Design an enzyme around this catalytic site. Structure first.
Site, PDB file in Angstrom:
ATOM      1  N   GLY A  87       0.792  -1.232   0.000  1.00 60.61           N
ATOM      2  CA  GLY A  87       0.000   0.000   0.000  1.00 60.61           C
ATOM      3  C   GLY A  87       0.822   1.278   0.000  1.00 60.61           C
ATOM      4  N   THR A  88       0.134   2.414  -0.113  1.00 60.35           N
ATOM      5  CA  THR A  88       0.785   3.729  -0.149  1.00 60.35           C
ATOM      6  C   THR A  88       1.253   4.135   1.252  1.00 60.35           C
ATOM      7  OG1 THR A  88      -1.133   5.183   0.273  1.00 60.35           O
ATOM      8  CG2 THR A  88      -0.842   4.388  -1.995  1.00 60.35           C
ATOM      9  N   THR A  89       2.117   5.146   1.323  1.00 54.46           N
ATOM     10  CA  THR A  89       2.720   5.547   2.596  1.00 54.46           C
ATOM     11  C   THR A  89       1.777   6.435   3.414  1.00 54.46           C
ATOM     12  OG1 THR A  89       4.869   5.564   1.441  1.00 54.46           O
ATOM     13  CG2 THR A  89       4.829   6.402   3.707  1.00 54.46           C
ATOM     14  N   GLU A 124      -0.076   9.529   1.491  1.00 54.18           N
ATOM     15  CA  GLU A 124       0.191   9.639   0.055  1.00 54.18           C
ATOM     16  C   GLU A 124      -0.996   9.097  -0.745  1.00 54.18           C
ATOM     17  OE1 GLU A 124       3.490   7.722  -3.086  1.00 54.18           O
ATOM     18  OE2 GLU A 124       3.203   6.792  -1.125  1.00 54.18           O
ATOM     19  N   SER A 158      -2.700   2.041   5.684  1.00 65.38           N
ATOM     20  CA  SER A 158      -2.116   1.597   4.425  1.00 65.38           C
ATOM     21  C   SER A 158      -2.480   0.139   4.188  1.00 65.38           C
ATOM     22  CB  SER A 158      -0.597   1.747   4.466  1.00 65.38           C
ATOM     23  OG  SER A 158      -0.231   3.097   4.685  1.00 65.38           O
TER      24      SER A 158
END
Ligand SMILES: [Cl-]
Lengths: 235, 244, 111, 250, 231, 243, 240, 195, 241
Positions: F29-31, F46, F74
């Site tokens: 996943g994204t940060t 993010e 995330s």
């Protein structure tokens, strides 16, 4: 083993796809829609000569304005018909009117995906639902165990279906008379059936606005069979 | 989920047999033999205890022969713990009938219901079947003396003479040979003991490896008596027929 | 003891012509000898050329109108936008009312 | 969520065996030896107290348990399984008997109820069988003294004397040579201590041995006086000191 | 492979294959397009038949007077989910006298789809949905995936060959977003968008399905001779 | 083997492989991050801009629980929403019975026990999210991070997703350089910098920054999203530091 | 509750548990139904690997559902009791609400419906039983014979057989039964039924059961000697 | 409902039951048969609350007929009476109890004896040489205490019954429109048409 | 071999899922120790905070179950907190139902019974934790009782748990061989804490700062944990002797 509601890697439900194979083993059922009525015909296919063929019941009344033909595991259809009849009568009790053919069909199709780990497996039978209402006139529907239903001008289901459907693609036009449709069902059934077609191993029916849903006598169908053989010899 | 660990106890083999029922019958064929013989004036129940130890308390013991009511008894072959579950159900069922109709329960009615419970465990619920076969011996005023057997499938049948458990094939052949219809109880006692003596997997049949019972009209006038034999009485009846 | 019913007064009237129909009602709303509102409408357009009034206990009147209006909405959703005929509306309202047979809506209904 | 295991975990194999029951008996074989001997005027049940660490206080772990004032239990196999069985056994003596008849159940019937509980763990959905064999000793007015063995299957057998667990085969043979139908309770205690020494390896004293009797009524252990018909428990746990006294005249 | 038997199992790289297989059913579905301006939102859908004797499977469903969606994948699953939306819109009206915000409609679908991805016995929904609506914050377009992921967009497309229309709309973004107060032009842009996803077949009169909702327009669907204007 | 095919099964190590597999979904996943400050907490995430067609500012990922707690996560986004929905139910029932809004440690254990419960049975799947969350209660500020196993701790700073290591390194510098404490407005700026620095590990698609905060002095102890002038100021501070 | 879907579709479109239930029927003792001009006769094989039986008390192969309808079967005996009990309860329930006994068609339709339900319910296996249901409708003299099977399908037959070697006896009946002229009397119908079983049975001793149903609740079971006379007479005409 | 009587003689049980069905100020029917045949040799008459009576009677009838078909056997009059008593004894503590009083006349074929049982709605069962439910008993019991003998013929029983009906037609306030009389003996149940 | 996936018996009469849950116990790589004084019961455990971003005050494996009962856990924190919440709830209910504070040994038995159920019932996994309960019981005095994933429990004179438990166990055994008594013959809990840390240092062979340890103390009518400075005060006292 594996879950009953599992998806294949191609995005299809295993059990639904397998029940479609069961329907391909069923006896042929054909429906044709005209502006004078809808005709429903089925192959009876008795497993033995000692079996009394008139006890084979593959065309069935849902209401006065709606009839139904079946193909596949026909024992599975009993509770579908029971639901259809109750849905139709219940709507008449709640609204003092006839239920639309499409609304009936949608109600039956709501049962279809009610399986899993609700019933234990999908239905192993396909239905041809034919009827009339004031809004959309004469209609023919193909109801599958997937929960999907299509309206058809003409449709064949069962073992002889893909050959019979190709024949229906050539023969159907928007000006067919009821008599023309009757003969056409007999003709195409005679083509795809194993044993030789007669009044005892095939059955006709129709739904008209005026007289409602009627299953034909063996005497009435026999004369339509004779009329058909004479017309094919006449050119 | 848990599907992974499901044995599926209530399914058919490709041949149309019930796996678990067949395997339960295989289990029962290793249990001590039990014999029932129906005479014109009574019924004999005879059963062989499973390989005994000398320090087992023999008199205060019950393993094979159980009383259902005053007119009906059973001989057991299989798991005893499974049998007691069923025996208690049968005992309650008898009392329910007596409470409802004010008449003692006809033997077949009791046998049918117990057999119906067994049947259920083979069709629904995902549970293992009861590893038990019964010989029912009883009396009612409709059919008089009756012998029945039921097994894990829930199927039951009526008999003049029958065996369950180990060596039934040899035991049945021997019973078929010496049984006749006009037979009396005391003749049937002898046949039962003679058959076990010839089919036993032990060296010699002794009093401490047997349970014995009779259901006679040998009370006083038109009524039925159940006699579960005491150790000493089995010792005497074994001498009286010259087996020891 | 708590009494779940009240009487909000007012009166309603329906007349039918050859190609029209009227449904009238006064706009007064009361409890006991007090006026709650001089203008509180109790005749409503329910769609599909059906007008409805449920007069008596206003809480039941509003609840019924609310349920029937919602019934018209779902009739469209379930039967391909088909128009709900007045005879079909009547039959539907019977079931709305009789469903509370043992704890009734305290109203006279006219459509 | 919810217990989706509504199916049997013990089923019949083609040969007829019930796998989980067999394997439970295997667990009992690995367990520490326990035994029971029936005398004319009492019953003795005994076992070794296998300590898990010398920092553990083995008095806080009781292998011999009172079920009713006249019934006691000991086991071989899995301790935790035994502990919950004792809880259940104590309760069922009340719910299915004392609360109905106003008196404690006879030994054979309490044994019957425990056997039922163990049978159900053999058939019900989503459970394994209990990994223990029990020896239950007790007294009741109309049956006198009795001793029973309950196995993982739910089967129970009455015994004059027997042993279960680690060195049961040798211990049973020892008991066959020594048992007669005229043994007095003190003679049975003596034979119990002799039989246990064969299977015990390390220390053999009143702190490593657990032993209880079913004998005479103990009015001093009742806790009250004034009711002539209440005369006290027949179950008594021998103290660490009482065991050592008998180990000198061994 | 060994980890695709049910939804309750993670693969070693952290994937849910049953959810991915459900996503695959959408890809086989007939193309449908969604796009909006500041005043209107428009759905365009290509309908699919069984053969020349059959009807064309309806792709668009009305949820309320201000909301509706189009479908690609398993049609019965769209019927279940649309019916749920119809109830949720309805509850908001009856209880709060409030039209359900198109955003909340998205959150509700996300949470309904999610529950079918964490429990044993169930299966993911096998359909993708494009929801359009007009509420108190103007026009909206949402994309529903049966993974649970709902996304608000100016324009989008799902189904077979949806990438053509999705690229087109990405180019046309600055043009169609400013088609305010002009319904027929916003539809024309959507009909041109869906044309970038056609192969061997072209848009006919019983083939094309268009829906529109906006400032002074209830959610309404056009079929048959009413779409002839746009071919 | 086969120990990894079913949730709640112990491997011979003593591990639950299905949870470890859920962790892989989180790492994909994204940060997202959390910074604890003088009198509150700051959250940032993010948002990968997949296409021009995404409406800016309109796919909000940070979520509020009650009126004083913020949550970001995330991994599988739907799984995170399920966890917040439960969090809201837990917080509501706590406020119903006890009147006072749920304390952050209390709220942390509510989520913890719920996630831990999804490692106890084979009929459920573990959560595919790590969740960073916190707020202000009667005892000041608290920041937490919760993982698929149910494990959670209090944090000075927290990071998860594809750029977690980059973000962690940047967080450790702030802890070392500011032993006395970081201000709320400073922490907002730093959050922007760290998300931009952690974007290097996901630099194909460009992104959209989203920040929120709870501060006793700056937001009156309530959760608020950072928008407009304060957001653009934080974006600019971040843009200056990458060059 | 135990939920497992035991009857499911396979890739080729078969439900194996239903098809394996048919194998249990194929293992069961042969049963035959033949209807005459004014009667129906139900004949049943009884295997002779069981001597020392008590025939007074052993469950009979043909069961009365009501005073006018009978049911025989092939397959698992324990399974059939559950079907018979349900049928008998429905028989009394129909008399109670409709104030008229069941038609043979209706009773058959109910029994078949029960069987079908056990093919798409969770936690249950299908019935390992096929039935022959025969009788006369209230105030009617036209003979009725129906057959059901595990799948749930049912149909009417002029004559039919089920169980082991049923394909052999069906063959016999297919050339020996004239639709234009059904056995005009009771004697003719019993004989044709006994003949058909003798193609498969062994000794015509205590191996054949015959039950005759005539109109207006007229059902009687034949004894050994009565049946033995048919066996004796058929063999003497055969030596020709 | 109202009048139901029963007399057990040497070889038979005779049941007499009033023919009127009255609701309000109207006699709605004068030919009502307040009886059900439970088995070939067992008959039950009934009186009590409207609706309840026939509903209970037919429910019992269905159960006894079900038993008959299951076991291919007829329950004894004693057994049937005990089943009926238990059903009423259950009923009396239900949310809505059956308000039905019954007489059961049967001929036990195993004993070759007539038997008459009186059971009220509470489930109070007694075997009697003669029985009555409701206000009828207040006239008929004393009458029968005087004229009844245990060895009477069926004909003597019918004359004894005529005496009861005559007394009731003289002293009872309501017009019960005569009785339907039925005899239960070794040959089953038959109805006397001219009474 | 599905007998290794759920809690059913293997052919040799073993439960592998229970055995593997025992291995999960050491997953944290932390060692714990409990001893008894005259008036008190002291439990100590290692505190390893590897990440600099963690708030060290929130990292704990010692729990206050009730006013009188404390519990230290060896095993993963999710399972640890699961056990702690249940224990708190059980102890609270006992007090409400029976009118007196739940004894340490009774809570131990109850938690052991719950653990036993997971070894018999299939749908529930065992918790990968070992629970050490400590108190000064009003009847039994200073008490240590310990539970494991098998459902086993017993009282202790003293105990240790963790990867290097055997070293600490023998170290304690050797002290009690020497002292000839069941406990630490000391008046104040401060010196019993000092004894505990001293004998952990000797057995593990490592030195501890104030943040490498965690200490719980049970006295009559209360169980409490020590702060970093309380432990530092205790570390200074050991060093100056
Ligand atoms: Cl407990």
């Amino acid at each position: 083993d594996r879950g009953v509601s599992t998806f294949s890697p191609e995005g299809r439900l295993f059990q639904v796809e397998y029940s479609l194979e069961a329907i391909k083993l069923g006896s042929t059922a054909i429906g044709i829609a005209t502006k004078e009525g809808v005709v429903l015909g089925v192959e009876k296919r008795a497993t033995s000569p000692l079996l009394e063929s008139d006890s084979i019941e593959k065309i069935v009344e849902i209401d006065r304005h709606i009839g139904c033909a079946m193909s596949g595991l026909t024992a599975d259809a009993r509770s579908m018909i029971e639901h259809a009849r109750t849905a139709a009568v219940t709507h008449n009790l709640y609204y003092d009117e006839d239920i639309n053919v499409e609304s009936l069909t949608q109600s039956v199709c709501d049962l279809a995906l009610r399986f899993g780990e609700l019933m234990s497996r999908p239905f192993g039978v396909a239905l041809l639902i034919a009827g009339h209402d004031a809004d959309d006139g004469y209609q023919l529907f193909h109801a599958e165990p997937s929960g999907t239903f299509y309206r058809y001008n003409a449709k064949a289901i069962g073992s002889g279906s893909e050959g019979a459907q190709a024949e229906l693609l050539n023969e159907w036009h928007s000006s067919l008379t009821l008599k023309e449709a009757e003969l056409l069902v007999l003709k195409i059934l005679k083509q795809v059936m194993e044993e030789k077609l007669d009044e005892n191993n095939a059955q006709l029916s129709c739904i008209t606005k005026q007289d409602g849903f009627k299953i034909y006598d063996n005497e009435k169908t026999a004369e339509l069979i004779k009329e058909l053989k004479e017309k094919e010899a006449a050119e | 989920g848990s599907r992974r660990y499901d044995s599926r106890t209530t399914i058919f083999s490709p041949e149309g047999r019930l796996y678990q029922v067949e395997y339960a019958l295989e289990s029962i064929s290793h249990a001590g033999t039990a014999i029932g013989i129906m005479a014109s004036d009574g019924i004999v129940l005879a059963a062989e205890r499973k390989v005994t130890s000398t320090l087992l308390e023999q008199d205060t013991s019950t393993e094979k022969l159980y009383k259902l009511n005053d007119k009906i008894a059973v001989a057991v072959a299989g798991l005893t713990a499974d049998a007691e579950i069923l025996i208690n159900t049968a005992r309650i069922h008898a009392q329910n009938y007596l409470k409802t109709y004010n008449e003692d329960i006809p033997v077949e009615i009791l046998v049918r219901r117990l057999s119906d419970i067994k049947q259920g465990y083979t069709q629904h619920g995902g549970l293992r079947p009861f590893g038990v076969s019964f010989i029912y011996a009883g009396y009612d005023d409709r059919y008089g003396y009756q012998l029945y057997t039921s097994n894990p499938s829930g199927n039951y049948t009526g008999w003049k003479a029958i065996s369950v458990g180990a060596n039934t094939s040899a035991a049945q052949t021997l019973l078929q040979m010496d049984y006749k219809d006009d037979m009396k109880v005391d003749d049937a006692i002898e046949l039962a003991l003679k058959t076990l003596s010839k089919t036993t997997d032990s060296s010699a049949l002794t009093y401490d490896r047997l349970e014995f019972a009779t259901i006679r009209k040998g009370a006083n006038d038109g009524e039925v008596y159940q006699k579960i034999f005491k150790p000493q009485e089995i010792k005497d009846i074994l001498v009286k027929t010259g087996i020891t | 003891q708590f009494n779940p019913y009240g009487d909000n007064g007012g009166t309603i009237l329906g007349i039918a012509g050859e190609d029209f129909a009227v449904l009238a009602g006064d706009t007064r709303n009361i409890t006991d000898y007090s006026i709650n509102s001089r203008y509180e409408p109790k005749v409503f357009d329910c769609g599909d050329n059906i007008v409805m009034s449920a007069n008596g206990f206003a809480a039941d009147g509003d609840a019924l109108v609310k349920r029937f209006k919602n019934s018209v909405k779902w009739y469209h959703f379930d039967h391909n936008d088909k128009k709900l005929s007045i005879n079909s509306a009547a039959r539907n309202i019977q079931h709305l009312l009789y469903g509370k047979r043992f704890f009734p809506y305290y109203v006279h209904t006219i459509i | 969520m919810t217990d989706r295991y509504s199916f049997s975990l013990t089923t019949f194999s083609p040969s007829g065996k019930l796998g989980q029951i067999d394997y439970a008996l295997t667990a009992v074989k690995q367990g520490v030896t326990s035994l029971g001997i029936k005398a004319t005027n009492g019953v003795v049940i005994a076992t070794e107290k296998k300590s898990s660490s010398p920092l553990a206080m083995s008095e806080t772990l009781s292998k011999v348990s009172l079920l009713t004032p006249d019934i006691g239990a000991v086991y071989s196999g899995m301790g935790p399984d035994y502990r919950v069985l004792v809880d259940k056994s104590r309760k069922v003596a009340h719910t299915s008997y004392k609360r109905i008849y106003g008196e404690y159940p006879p030994t054979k019937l309490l044994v019957s109820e425990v056997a039922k509980i163990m049978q159900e763990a053999t058939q019900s959905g989503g459970v394994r069988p209990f990994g223990v064999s029990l020896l239950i000793a007790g007294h009741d007015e109309f049956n006198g003294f009795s001793l029973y063995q309950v196995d993982p299957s739910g089967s129970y057998f009455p015994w004059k004397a027997t042993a279960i667990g680690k060195g049961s085969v040798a211990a049973k043979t020892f008991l066959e040579k020594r048992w007669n139908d005229e043994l007095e309770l003190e003679d049975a205690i003596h034979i119990a201590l002799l039989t246990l020494k064969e299977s015990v390896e390390g220390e053999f004293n009143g702190d490593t041995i657990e032993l209880a009797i079913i004998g005479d009524e103990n009015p001093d252990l009742l806790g009250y006086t004034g009711i002539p018909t209440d005369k006290g428990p027949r179950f008594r746990k021998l103290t660490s000191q009482e065991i050592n006294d008998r180990l000198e005249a061994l | 492979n060994n980890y695709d038997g049910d939804t309750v199992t993670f693969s070693p790289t952290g994937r849910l294959f049953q959810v991915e297989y459900a996503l695959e059913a959408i890809k086989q579905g007939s193309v449908t397009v969604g796009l909006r301006s500041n005043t209107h939102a428009v759905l365009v859908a290509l309908k699919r038949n069984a053969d020349e004797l059959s009807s064309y499977q309806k792709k668009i469903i009305k949820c309320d007077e201000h909301m509706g969606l189009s479908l690609a994948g398993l049609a019965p699953d769209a019927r279940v989910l649309s019916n749920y939306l119809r109830q949720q819109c309805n509850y908001s009206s009856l209880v709060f006298n409030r039209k359900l915000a198109v955003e909340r409609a998205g959150h509700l679908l996300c949470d309904k789809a999610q529950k079918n991805t964490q429990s044993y016995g169930g299966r993911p929904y096998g359909v993708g949905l494009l929801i359009i609506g007009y509420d108190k914050s103007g026009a909206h377009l949402l994309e529903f995936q049966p993974s649970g992921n709902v996304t608000e967009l100016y324009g989008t497309a799902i189904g077979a060959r949806s990438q053509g229309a999705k690229t087109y709309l990405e180019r046309t973004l600055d043009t169609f977003i400013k088609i305010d107060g002009n319904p027929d032009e916003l539809i024309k842009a959507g009909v041109e968008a869906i044309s970038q996803s056609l192969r061997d077949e072209s848009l006919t009169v019983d083939n094309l399905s268009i829906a529109i909702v906006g400032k002074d327009t209830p959610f309404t669907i056009y079929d048959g001779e009413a779409v002839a204007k746009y071919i | 083997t086969g120990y990894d095919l079913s949730n709640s099964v112990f491997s011979p190590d003593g591990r639950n492989f299905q949870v470890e597999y859920a962790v892989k979904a989180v790492e994909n996943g994204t940060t997202s991050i959390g910074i604890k400050c003088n009198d509150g907490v700051v959250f940032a995430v993010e948002k990968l801009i997949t296409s021009k067609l995404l409406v800016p500012q309109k796919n909000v990922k940070i979520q509020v629980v009650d009126r004083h707690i913020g949550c970001v996560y995330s991994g599988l986004i739907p799984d995170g929403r399920h966890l917040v929905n439960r969090g809201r139910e837990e917080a509501a029932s706590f406020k119903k019975l006890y009147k006072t809004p749920i304390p952050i440690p209390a709220f942390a254990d509510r989520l913890g026990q719920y996630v831990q419960a999804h490692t106890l049975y084979n009929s459920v799947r573990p959560f595919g999210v790590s969740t960073i969350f916190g707020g202000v209660d009667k005892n000041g500020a608290h920041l937490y991070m919760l993982e698929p196993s149910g494990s959670y701790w209090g944090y000075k700073g927290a990071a998860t997703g594809k750029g977690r290591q980059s973000a962690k390194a940047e967080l450790e510098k702030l802890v070392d350089h500011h032993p006395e404490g970081l201000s709320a407005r400073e922490a907002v700026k730093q959050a922007a910098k760290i998300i931009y620095l952690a974007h290097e590990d996901n630099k194909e698609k460009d992104f959209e920054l989203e920040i929120s905060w709870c501060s006793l002095s700056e937001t009156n102890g309530l959760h608020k999203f950072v928008k407009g002038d304060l957001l653009q100021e934080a974006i600019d501070f971040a843009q200056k530091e990458i060059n | 509750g135990y939920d497992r879907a035991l009857s499911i579709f396979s890739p080729d479109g078969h439900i194996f548990q239903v098809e394996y239930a048919l194998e249990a029927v194929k293992r069961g003792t042969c049963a035959v139904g033949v209807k005459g001009k004014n009667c129906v006769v139900l004949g049943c094989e009884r295997r002779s690997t069981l001597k020392l039986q008590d025939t007074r008390i052993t469950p009979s192969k043909v069961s009365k559902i009501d005073s006018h309808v009978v049911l025989s079967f092939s397959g698992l005996n324990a399974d059939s009791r559950i079907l018979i009990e349900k049928a008998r309860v429905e028989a009394q329930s129909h008399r109670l609400t409709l104030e008229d006994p069941v038609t043979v068609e209706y009773l058959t339709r109910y029994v078949a419906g029960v069987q079908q339900r056990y093919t798409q319910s969770g936690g249950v296996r299908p019935f390992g039983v096929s039935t022959l249901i025969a009788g006369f409708d209230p105030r009617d003299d036209e003979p009725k014979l129906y057959q059901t099977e595990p799948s749930g399908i049912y149909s009417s037959w002029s004559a039919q057989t089920i169980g082991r070697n049923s394909k052999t006896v069906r063959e016999f009946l297919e050339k020996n039964y004239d639709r234009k002229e059904p056995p005009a009397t009771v004697e003719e119908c019993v004989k044709l039924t006994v003949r058909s079983l003798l193609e498969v049975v062994q000794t015509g001793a205590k191996n054949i059961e015959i039950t005759v149903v005539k109109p207006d609740s007229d059902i009687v079971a034949l004894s050994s000697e009565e049946i033995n006379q048919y066996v004796t007479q058929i063999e003497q005409e055969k030596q020709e | 409902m109202d009048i139901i009587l029963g007399i057990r003689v040497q070889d038979s049980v005779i049941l007499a039951s009033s023919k009127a069905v009255t609701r309000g100020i109207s006699v709605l029917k004068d030919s009502d048969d307040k009886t059900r045949q439970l088995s070939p040799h067992t008959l039950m008459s009934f009186a009590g609350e409207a609706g309840d009576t026939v509903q209970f009677a037919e429910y019992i009838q269905a159960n006894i007929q079900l038993y008959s078909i299951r076991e291919d056997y007829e329950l004894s009059p004693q057994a049937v009476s005990s089943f009926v008593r238990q059903e009423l004894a259950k009923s009396i503590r239900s949310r809505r109890p059956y308000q039905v009083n019954v007489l059961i006349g049967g001929y036990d074929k195993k004993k070759n004896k007539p038997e008459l049982y009186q059971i009220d709605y509470l489930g109070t069962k007694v075997e009697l040489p003669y029985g009555a439910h409701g206000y009828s008993g207040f006239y008929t019991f004393s009458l029968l205490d005087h004229h009844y003998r245990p060895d009477m013929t069926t004909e003597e029983g019918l004359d004894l019954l005529k005496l009861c009906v005559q007394e009731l037609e003289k002293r009872m306030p309501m017009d019960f429109k005569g009785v339907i009389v039925k005899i239960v003996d070794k040959d089953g149940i038959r109805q006397v048409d001219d009474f | 071999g599905y007998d290794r996936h759920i809690t059913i018996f293997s052919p040799e009469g073993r439960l592998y899922q229970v055995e593997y849950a025992f291995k999960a116990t050491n997953q944290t790589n932390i060692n714990s120790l409990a001893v008894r004084g005259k008036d008190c019961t002291v439990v100590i455990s290692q505190k390893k905070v590897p990440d600099k971003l963690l708030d060290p005050t929130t990292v704990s494996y010692i729990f206050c179950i009730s006013r009188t009962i404390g519990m230290v856990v060896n095993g993963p924190i999710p399972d640890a907190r699961n056990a702690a919440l249940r224990a708190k709830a059980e102890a609270a209910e006992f007090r409400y139902k029976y009118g007196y504070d739940m004894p340490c040994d009774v809570l131990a038995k109850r938690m052991a019974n719950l653990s036993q159920i997971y070894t018999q019932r299939a749908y529930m996994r065992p918790l990968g934790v070992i629970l050490t309960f400590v108190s000064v019981d009003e009847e039994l005095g200073p008490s240590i009782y310990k539970t494991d994933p098998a459902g086993y429990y017993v009282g202790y004179k003293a105990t240790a748990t963790g990867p290097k438990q055997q070293e600490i166990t023998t170290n304690l055994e050797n002290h009690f061989k020497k002292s000839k008594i069941d406990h630490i013959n000391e008046e104040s809990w401060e010196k019993v804490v000092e004894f505990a840390i001293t004998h952990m240092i000797d057995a593990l062979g490592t030195e501890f700062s104030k943040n490498d340890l965690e200490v719980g103390v049970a006295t009559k009518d209360k169980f409490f944990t020590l702060s970093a400075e309380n432990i530092e005060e205790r570390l200074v006292a050991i060093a100056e002797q």
